Amino acid sequence: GVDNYVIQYLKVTDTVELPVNDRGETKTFTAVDLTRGKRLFEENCKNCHVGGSTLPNPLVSLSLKDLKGATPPRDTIASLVAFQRSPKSYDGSEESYSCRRVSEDWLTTEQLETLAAFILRAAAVAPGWGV
Amino acid sequence: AGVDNYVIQYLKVTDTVELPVNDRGETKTFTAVDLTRGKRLFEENCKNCHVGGSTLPNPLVSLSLKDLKGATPPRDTIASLVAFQRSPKSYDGSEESYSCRRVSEDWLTTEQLETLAAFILRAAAVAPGWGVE
Ligand code: HEC
Ligand code: HEC
Ligand SMILES: [Cl-]
């Protein structure tokens, strides 16, 4: 059903509101959404981003501090989604081939939004994330 | 949850299977439960780069049986895959690789890594599409 990590570490039991853009819009995500997103993160991302780290480039982690230091900041659903569709360097000036680009054939919009939600929520509230 | 369907239907192992344990013709007996455990370890630790037997960051060095057997020395036995994972090497074996995931004994025990090697080895042999990407 719902993952206990989402219960325990993300502190979500029903729903949660997350920033979609820099404009002021939010989107509601359920606990099952964040559970699905956690699973997608395990299948596609965790091997390089264990615990919110970035093993092949420790300065550019998935911590909220590091996401907010990116150009543009990677602290919203829309900016995280846009990033995975075409990964970029930290200053955003060059294409990066070190992280995993995800096509719409691989993850649909809905799926990638759950992944971004899991990462954004974990960045905001999970103990130890990005350490 | 005891034996996963993928192992029955795609690895074609219901009871046991015999896999090359070393280069001198010796095999070791793995059960369907062993391969299920190895699959789970692969899904948890290796799948971002090696989904379906591919190698996303270097597709020329995949988990296909062809590519495994062409490594130096060949990576087509339990012992050779375990030794690889403990300290990953380049394809010709002359240099240390930092592009794959080294697995310390603190991460996976000998037996666990054996079951992961067995999963990869059986998949390479019989799983439809494995490594052909
Ligand atoms: C290893 C091969 C990786 C996998 C698999 C995934 N990512 Fe990654 N990511 C990786 C590196 C080496 C980097 C640094 C990139 C650079 O060129 O600077 C990243 C970066 C990110 C970031 C940006 C973090 C920041 O502080 O700005 C994000 C948000 C990110 N990665 C997400 C991500 C997701 C969701 C993945 C699963 C689909 C994923 N990455 C896979 C290395 C690797
Ligand atoms: C991405 C970050 C990887 C993860 C996670 C794992 N592997 Fe890997 N592997 C990766 C690369 C880029 C390469 C090519 C290496 C080179 O220097 O030539 C490999 C290679 C292997 C091999 C050898 C394949 C061959 O044809 O000889 C094996 C057996 C292998 N990888 C297994 C493996 C396992 C079991 C992992 C999970 C524990 C794993 N890899 C993670 C990239 C990445
Ligand atoms: Cl891993």
UniProtKB/Swiss-Prot annotation, chain B:
Its main location: membrane. Its cofactor is heme c. It is found in: Cellular thylakoid membrane. Heme c binds at residues 46, 49-50, 100. Keywords: Electron transport, Heme, Iron, Membrane, Metal-binding, Photosynthesis, Photosystem II, Signal, Thylakoid, Transport. It comes from the Bacteria. This is Cytochrome c-550-like protein. The lineage of its organism: Bacteria, Bacillati, Cyanobacteriota, Cyanophyceae, Acaryochloridales. The chain holds residues 36 to 168 of 175 of the full protein.
